[PDB]
Amino acid sequence: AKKMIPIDDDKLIMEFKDDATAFDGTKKARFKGKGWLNAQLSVIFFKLLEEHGIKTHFIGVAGGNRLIVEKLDMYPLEVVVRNVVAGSLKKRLPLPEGYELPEPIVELYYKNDELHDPMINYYHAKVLGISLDEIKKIEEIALKVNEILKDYLAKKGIILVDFKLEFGKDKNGDIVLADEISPDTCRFWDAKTKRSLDKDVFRFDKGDLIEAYKEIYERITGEKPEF
Amino acid sequence: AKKMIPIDDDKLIMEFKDDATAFDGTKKARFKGKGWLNAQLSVIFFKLLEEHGIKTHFIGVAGGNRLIVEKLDMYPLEVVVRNVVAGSLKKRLPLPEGYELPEPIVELYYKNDELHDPMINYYHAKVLGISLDEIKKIEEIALKVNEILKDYLAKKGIILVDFKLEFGKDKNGDIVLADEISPDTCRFWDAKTKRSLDKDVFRFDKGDLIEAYKEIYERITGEKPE
Numbered sequence: 001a002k003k004m005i006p007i008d009d010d011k012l013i014m015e016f017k018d019d020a021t022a023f024d025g026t027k028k029a030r031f032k033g034k035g036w037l038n039a040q041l042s043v044i045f046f047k048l049l050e051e052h053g054i055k056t057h058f059i060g061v062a063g064g065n066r067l068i069v070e071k072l073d074m075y076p077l078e079v080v081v082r083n084v085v086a087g088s089l090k091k092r093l094p095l096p097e098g099y100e101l102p103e104p105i106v107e108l109y110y111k112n113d114e115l116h117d118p119m120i121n122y123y124h125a126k127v128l129g130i131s132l133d134e135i136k137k138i139e140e141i142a143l144k145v146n147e148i149l150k151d152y153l154a155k156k157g158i159i160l161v162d163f164k165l166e167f168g169k170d171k172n173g174d175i176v177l178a179d180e181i182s183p184d185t186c187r188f189w190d191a192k193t194k195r196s197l198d199k200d201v202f203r204f205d206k207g208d209l210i211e212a213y214k215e216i217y218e219r220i221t222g223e224k225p226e227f
Numbered sequence: 228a229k230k231m232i233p234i235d236d237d238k239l240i241m242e243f244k245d246d247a248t249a250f251d252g253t254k255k256a257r258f259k260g261k262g263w264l265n266a267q268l269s270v271i272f273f274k275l276l277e278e279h280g281i282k283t284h285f286i287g288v289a290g291g292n293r294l295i296v297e298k299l300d301m302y303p304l305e306v307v308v309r310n311v312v313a314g315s316l317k318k319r320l321p322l323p324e325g326y327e328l329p330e331p332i333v334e335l336y337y338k339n340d341e342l343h344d345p346m347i348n349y350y351h352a353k354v355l356g357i358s359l360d361e362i363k364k365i366e367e368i369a370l371k372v373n374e375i376l377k378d379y380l381a382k383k384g385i386i387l388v389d390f391k392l393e394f395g396k397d398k399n400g401d402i403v404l405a406d407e408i409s410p411d412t413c414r415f416w417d418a419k420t421k422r423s424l425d426k427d428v429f430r431f432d433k434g435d436l437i438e439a440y441k442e443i444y445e446r447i448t449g450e451k452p453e
């Protein structure tokens with residue numbers, strides 16, 4: 001759902017598309033406005049994190065659905081942080097969907113579509129060339145990010161249930177938060193009703209996608225989506 | 228503003244009074260309902276914390292303004308946690324009142340009225356007989372308590388600006404959260420307006436005390452104070 005367009009050796013344009021894809025592309029659709037919503041939400045989040053001293057790849061905006069980002073040497077990881085039991089965590093722990101976890105959980109997955117993104121631990125990560133030291137930096141950043149996003153969204157009646165992050169190395173060798181932060185890459189639930197306000201609405205046809213994404217945007221900004 | 232009444236070698240009664248005192252007792256008053264409100268708010272906070280596995284001195288209630296607590300060998304400390312610049316932090320950092328800190332700040336004060344509770348570091352703590360190991364336990368508990376209280380209050384439109392905790396050792400030698408947790412010992416601001424809902428209302432005559440404390444209570448319980 002993104003187009004990455006190289007500017008040069010140190011920066012690129014991340015363009016958000018209106019395509020919605022799930023279950024390995026066996027389920028596809030297009031939602032007018034999704035790209036714009038996701039881009040804008042990414043901006044909001046990256047700036048919010050940046051304000052707390054989190055280093056992110058965000059440089060600026062170049063149109064409604066286009067972000068300018070620093071080019072990174074990417075870690076071959078999905079870094080997942082989980083506050084409430086949902087999705088695949090139900091297959092790992094003996095706990096009901098909706099269960100509030102006493103502490104956030106960080107899972108690492110190997111970014112590899114052919115292997116369908118398997119979960120890995122610190123030993124696997126070393127084999128893939130990621131030192132124990134980098135891993136603990138990554139996890140520390142991820143937990144910090146989790147706390148800022150969770151607390152921000154909670155004040156607006158949104159539960160941050162879980163989410164996926166990606167990281168890379170910049171020119172200086174610092175670890176930098178990358179990719180996107182949107183309802184495509186997080187589970188957001190309404191605090192009162194516990195309805196999904198994210199891609200699960202598409203994955204399991206539980207409602208109107210553009211509607212839920214608008215709802216997130218409206219709650220955060222206090223303003224109906226422009227486009 | 229509290230009366231500590233020994234039951235035996237392991238328990239005591241903490242009684243909350245309606246007396247309000249500030250600036251070393253040079254500014255005193257009484258507010259009908261304060262003790263009750265403070266006691267009840269302490270109950271709510273201690274049980275909330277106990278629900279997260281924080282060990283506290285809270286045993287139970289013995290009337291509207293009386294708590295039954297475990298007797299502890301107390302650390303001679305105020306352990307202050309700060310999320311938002313206010314009060315004496317303005318005199319330490321070059322930052323405006325209301326400034327949101329990137330991380331929470333933990334400060335240690337030596338509990339001693341004659342010295343007016345001076346700030347200390349880990350070296351002073353050791354002199355006062357507190358090991359580096361205890362200090363880090365204390366600080367890890369304080370940071371935990373901060374995150375639970377801050378998140379809980381935030382959902383209710385209350386900013387946990389800063390607060391003071393006290394700790395003691397029980398029979399087993401575990402570190403136990405003690406004293407009280409009320410608008411007497413924390414700074415609470417309304418999220419929208421940023422007005423004080425705590426003892427700063429009394430300290431600096433910025434409004435009606437019983438009103439602000441009731442506000443806190445009502446927001447937390449969803450019910451007017453009984």
Ligand SMILES: Nc1ncnc2c1ncn2[C@@H]1O[C@H](COP(=O)(O)OP(=O)(O)O)[C@@H](O)[C@H]1O
Pocket residue numbers: 001002003004057069070071072073074166168178179180
């Ligand atoms: N700052 C960055 N530098 C280099 N690569 C990035 C950066 N941010 C994201 N990427 C990578 O670009 C790709 C974004 O493509 P996307 O549309 O999310 O689909 P896919 O996961 O199929 O690649 C991902 O591979 C992501 O890891």
Ligand SMILES: Nc1ncnc2c1ncn2[C@@H]1O[C@H](COP(=O)(O)OP(=O)(O)O)[C@@H](O)[C@H]1O
Pocket residue numbers: 228229230231284296297298299300301393395405406407
């Ligand atoms: N569980 C406990 N066991 C023993 N002492 C405690 C416990 N909780 C609080 N204390 C102490 O009881 C005293 C109550 O003091 P208080 O009346 O609040 O005013 P001050 O702090 O000015 O003495 C304090 O010295 C406090 O440190």
Ligand SMILES: Nc1ncnc2c1ncn2[C@@H]1O[C@H](COP(=O)(O)O)[C@@H](O)[C@H]1O
Pocket residue numbers: 078080086087088089162163164184185186187199
């Ligand atoms: N490949 C991916 N792309 C986008 N988001 C993901 C991906 N993998 C996991 N997530 C997010 O990570 C969280 C946990 O997902 P799951 O492991 O499917 O239960 C959810 O918020 C997902 O949206």
Ligand SMILES: Nc1ncnc2c1ncn2[C@@H]1O[C@H](COP(=O)(O)O)[C@@H](O)[C@H]1O
Pocket residue numbers: 305307313314315316344389390391411412413414
């Ligand atoms: N001696 C004390 N009694 C009660 N509360 C205190 C005391 N010292 C500090 N605090 C609390 O800790 C926070 C920081 O206080 P200060 O350093 O005075 O700005 C405030 O919320 C105070 O209410």
